[PDB]
Amino acid sequence: VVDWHKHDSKRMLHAVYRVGDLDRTIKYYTECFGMKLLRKRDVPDEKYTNAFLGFGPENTNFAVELTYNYGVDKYDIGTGFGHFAIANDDVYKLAENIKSKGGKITREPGPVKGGSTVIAFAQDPDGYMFQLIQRADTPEPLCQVMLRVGDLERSIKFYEKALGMKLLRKKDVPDYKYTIAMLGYADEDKTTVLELTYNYGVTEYSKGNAYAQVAIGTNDVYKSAEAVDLATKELGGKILRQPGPLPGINTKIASFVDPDGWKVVLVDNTDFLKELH
Numbered sequence: 001v002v003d004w005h006k007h008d009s010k011r012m013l014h015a016v017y018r019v020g021d022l023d024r025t026i027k028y029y030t031e032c033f034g035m036k037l038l039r040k041r042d043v044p045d046e047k048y049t050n051a052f053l054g055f056g057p058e059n060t061n062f063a064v065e066l067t068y069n070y071g072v073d074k075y076d077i078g079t080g081f082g083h084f085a086i087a088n089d090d091v092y093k094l095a096e097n098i099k100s101k102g103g104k105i106t107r108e109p110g111p112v113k114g115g116s117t118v119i120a121f122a123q124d125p126d127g128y129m130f131q132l133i134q135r136a137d138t139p140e141p142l143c144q145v146m147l148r149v150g151d152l153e154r155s156i157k158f159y160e161k162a163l164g165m166k167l168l169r170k171k172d173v174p175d176y177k178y179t180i181a182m183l184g185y186a187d188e189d190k191t192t193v194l195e196l197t198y199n200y201g202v203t204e205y206s207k208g209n210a211y212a213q214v215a216i217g218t219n220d221v222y223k224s225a226e227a228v229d230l231a232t233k234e235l236g237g238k239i240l241r242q243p244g245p246l247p248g249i250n251t252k253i254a255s256f257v258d259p260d261g262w263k264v265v266l267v268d269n270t271d272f273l274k275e276l277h
């Protein structure tokens, strides 16, 4: 009866991570990457400011949630965090826009080494990598969060059983000693996937203190947390916050780490809508 996965309607909501200079990142994402600034919220009582950016409204699209901590101008990215990706129908056009705007292209546009898909890489002001992926027409340009993991097979099993993700793609690249998987809730080219990368013989990475978590919406945080609890008893990872409403707000969430220590927050799909204004 973990056929709850089949009855839920989960959705990748946003990646949350920290930035040294909020205005600098906003300007880089709007001007270099063509994102929209969706919402900005200042929180003096707790000493931070958030900004939310993406390619459509947060009720239908995935977003980045940026956290600026007062008087903190840098973070450790760590070695485990891979990249965010942006799909675009002309990666040459986009890369040259980024260069024009004074952005950093670290990997010029061209087919992936060993494959055919045209990709490029940009580096943002804090050091976060953005892959650019040539793709004809997606409803979701902000289309990957890539994380490194120590055991690809353990992680695939974990995301399937804990989160109801489908394994969309698994690809071994022995010439370059890595293997990838993409997991998510719809066809890869229509959605935001989680891309997990294993490098041969590498079992550990630093989580840093820059990337915080990914948030995933669910029709019921209690049912979905039960599935997480079962998966963690078998496969590794740990519940952080048990399912329930947050103090005062009544917004229902649960949170956990995966077998490698990456954090995921489950948020009630309807409660999530309560801040999107």
Ligand SMILES: N[C@@H](CCC(=O)N[C@@H](CS)C(=O)NCC(=O)O)C(=O)O
Binding pocket: 082, 107, 111, 112, 113, 148, 176, 178, 180, 197, 199
């Ligand atoms: N060691 C790499 C392995 C993954 C990898 O190389 N992925 C491809 C895309 S699937 C890439 O970045 N290739 C570099 C290129 O084509 O220049 C990592 O951990 O990031």
Ligand SMILES: [Co+2]
Binding pocket: 083, 085, 131, 144, 146, 195
């Ligand atoms: Co990627």
